[PDB]
Amino acid sequence: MTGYLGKTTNQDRDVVSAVAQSERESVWGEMPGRVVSVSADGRTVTVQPLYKPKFNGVPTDMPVLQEVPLRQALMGGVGVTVPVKPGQNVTLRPQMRSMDNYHVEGDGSASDSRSFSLSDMEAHIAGGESLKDVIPNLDSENVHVRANADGSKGMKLSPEGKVEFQGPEGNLLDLIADFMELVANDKLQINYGSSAGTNHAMANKAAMLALAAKVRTTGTI
Amino acid sequence: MTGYLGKTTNQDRDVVSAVAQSERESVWGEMPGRVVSVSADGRTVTVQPLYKPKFNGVPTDMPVLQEVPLRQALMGGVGVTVPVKPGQNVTLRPQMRSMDNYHVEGDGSASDSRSFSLSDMEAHIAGGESLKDVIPNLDSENVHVRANADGSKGMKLSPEGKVEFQGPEGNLLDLIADFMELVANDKLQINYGSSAGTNHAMANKAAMLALAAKVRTTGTI
Amino acid sequence: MTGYLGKTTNQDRDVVSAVAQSERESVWGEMPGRVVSVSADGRTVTVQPLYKPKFNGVPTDMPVLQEVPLRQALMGGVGVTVPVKPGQNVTLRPQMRSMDNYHVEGDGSASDSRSFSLSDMEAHIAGGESLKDVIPNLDSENVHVRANADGSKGMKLSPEGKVEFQGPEGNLLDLIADFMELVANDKLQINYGSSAGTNHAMANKAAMLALAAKVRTTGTI
């Protein structure tokens, strides 16, 4: 810290800790950002941060970070994805060294030779949102996979192994169970003294059809 | 490093690299922590880190980190969740600058002007556990989703696309197949010379009821 | 930066910011890396990271990082996994301090007293691949989980809650719905004037068997 004791007989120690603290400022790190656009190929995002540096004691902003490498949790493509849309919140993380042409050519080495640049940011899905703005319905006991902001449509999975595919129609396991329970309760319908091979149908045909069409209406994305 | 050559004719180089080196000390980074408590909203965790500093040559503690923003891998709520419980291990990461009132007010800026404070740690789910303590049953070939510590209940999914919902009762696809196969082997039971519409029941009704109750007992969380 | 004004009357400011600059180089940060081998216990990976720092004006290579703690997105074992194989891309992160025997012993402090060592890298799924190399089929509207590099065999899950287990055989909800629709369209087959309890069978028995065997062939991993 600057000037422990006074004006202009500034200790040599002060003016050295001053350069160390200045260079410690200069390093980038984590910070939140709002997505502006998502590239059609789905790996680079036009990220508007949420941090401004300190300039003229006042808010200025650095430019919108462009062609920021979006980073889903995938190993060789095999992994999980989240549909990124404009207005979402990501976390910007700088690189030790730029990786310009490790991305432009794959053969991995950047342009000149530095450290920790602002043009070195990657966007990650965990670490961005604010505590003020609340995400509703945070399941606390069971693994939850969310397909909507409210987490009211997706997959729920229990320590015992219980499952829930809570889609639009309802609990898919339950609806299939309803179908098969009507089978295990079903009673064929007889029409006449007709012993030749004609016109027998299950008494509960309509509900079976209804559930059968429901499973496709909740199944064909 | 301090004192490359000796006592008190310490080179101006030594007493400058020592300052840069202490300021390099002072920065925080990634380190494991144990969850102490989890807020009801499910976003802030009381974390006791597992990194301790060095002080008076001796183990001392900096306090249990409080209202550490828990950060699941969600984007707009749409993502994956893990049920955080008191005793699990997270990885704590500091931020370049603090977000006091970026979390207290959403409008994004903290109090005075620092870098890299210990009060800037976010907790992430990956990066905390120790290699001594072994996580059993690490599926190596198929993408595995777990709902238990032993990884014996959940969703297993193969490169070919094979699926397994290994719940309490067993492979749900197998149990649904054990239902469909009994229908495809089914043989209706005829009662009397009764050609009016009465008392026809599927011969394998009891087992279809059994599988039907199984699918709800493994489906209604 | 070095020498703002010239040869050998180098300002005291220059030869101090140069020390700060060098010590700012020395710190490690992220970098992409290639998996070489994966330990049988499934938590440590032999990694050949794709970065060389600058040596003798030229590529030299810092050696294959060993017993690098692999870090899946789990807490207590409960979480998601990706099958790590030799040749995939991870991102590395060093810590503020090494954790030698917080992994050798789980009691939590490494050997001497440092900061920020090369020997302290955790490997993480997200952040490693190059933008040149394209990961195909990035589902951009629905939560997608993959079991193959092409993202063509896995599970898709929509904001409305629609589901798709696109396995080798096809949409599992579609195939189960095909089964239920043929039951709800089925019409028992009569054999003779046989009113005693014999030989009645489903009219569409063969297709019901086909679907029933399909679900096991897509279900038993």
- Listed in sequence order, the residues at least 6 apart from A17 whose beta carbon sits closer than 8 Å to its beta carbon are A1, B19, B23
Are C152 and B159 a contacting pair, CB within 8 Å?
A: no
Region of C19 please: left (phi>0), alpha (psi -120 to 50) or beta: alpha
Task: Pull the structure tokens for residue B82.
Answer: 């893990």
Task: Pull the structure tokens for residue B27.
Answer: 């920065």
Q: Which of B78, A175, A153 is nearest to C161 (CA)?
A: A153
Residue C218 to chain B, least CA–CA distance (Å)? 5
For C78, the closest of A122, A143, A146 (CB atoms) is: A143
Task: Pull the structure tokens for residue C26.
Answer: 């020395």
Burial class (CB in 10 A: 0-12, 13-18, 19+), B9: exposed
Are A18 and C16 a contacting pair, CB within 8 Å?
A: no
Cβ separation of B150 and C77 shorter than 8 Å? Answer: yes
Enumerate the residues of chain C whose CB falls inside 8 A of the CB of residue B54: 113
Tell me the C-alpha distance between C202 and B185, whole Å: 8
Cβ separation of C25 and A115 shorter than 8 Å? Answer: yes
Enumerate the residues of chain A whose CB falls inside 8 A of the CB of residue B70: none
- Please tell me whether residue B26 adopts helix, strand or coil conformation: coil
Are C82 and A74 a contacting pair, CB within 8 Å?
A: yes
Q: Which amino acid is at B187?
A: K
Q: Best of C54, C95, C140 to disrupt the A interface by mutation (most A CBs within 10 Å)? A: C140
Q: Which amino acid is at B176?
A: I
Enumerate the residues of chain A whose CB falls inside 8 A of the CB of residue C172: 219
Q: Entry resolution in angstroms?
A: 3.2
Are B198 and A190 a contacting pair, CB within 8 Å?
A: yes
Q: Which of C73, C87, C217 is nearest to C145 (CA)?
A: C73
DSSP code, position B150 = T
Tell me the C-alpha distance between A138 and B23, whole Å: 40
Q: Which of B88, B90, B87, B89 is nearest to B71 (CA)?
A: B90
CB pairs under 8 A between A and C: 244
Cβ separation of B88 and C75 shorter than 8 Å? Answer: yes
DSSP code, position C219 = T
* Beta-bridge partner residues of B34: B48, B89
Tell me the C-alpha distance between A89 and B74, whole Å: 9
Burial class (CB in 10 A: 0-12, 13-18, 19+), A111: exposed
Enumerate the residues of chain B whose CB falls inside 8 A of the CB of residue C165: 161, 163
For B17, the closest of C19, C165, C201 (CB atoms) is: C19
Are A201 and A189 a contacting pair, CB within 8 Å?
A: yes
Pairing of strands A122-124, A143-146: unpaired
Are A163 and A173 a contacting pair, CB within 8 Å?
A: yes
Q: Which amino acid is at A20?
A: A
Are C143 and B145 a contacting pair, CB within 8 Å?
A: no
Tell me the C-alpha distance between B30 and C41, whole Å: 23
Largest CA distance in chain B: 117
DSSP per-residue letters across chain A = ---SS-SS---HHHHHHHHHHHHHHH----EEEEEEEE-TTSSEEEEEES----BTTB---PPPEEEEEB--SEETTEEB-----TT-EEEEE--SS--HHHHHSSS---SS--S--GGG-EEESSS-S-SSS--S---SSSEEEESSTTS-SEEEE-TT--EEEE-SSSBHHHHHHHHHHHHHT--EEP-SS--SS---EETTHHHHHHHHHHHHHTT--
Tell me the C-alpha distance between C149 and C133, whole Å: 12
In degrees and rounded to multiples of 5, residue B88 shows phi and psi of: -80, 170
DSSP code, position B58 = B
CA end-to-end span of chain A, whole Å? 60
Residue B140 to chain C, least CA–CA distance (Å)? 5
Task: Pull the structure tokens for residue B51.
Answer: 């990194």
Task: Pull the structure tokens for residue B198.
Answer: 């009465």
- Listed in sequence order, the residues at least 6 apart from B116 whose beta carbon sits closer than 8 Å to its beta carbon are A24, A29, B26, B27, B28, B94, B95, B96, B97
Tell me the C-alpha distance between A122 and A142, whole Å: 31
Tell me the C-alpha distance between B72 and B79, whole Å: 8
Q: Which of C88, C74, A155, C153 is nearest to B137 (CA)?
A: C74
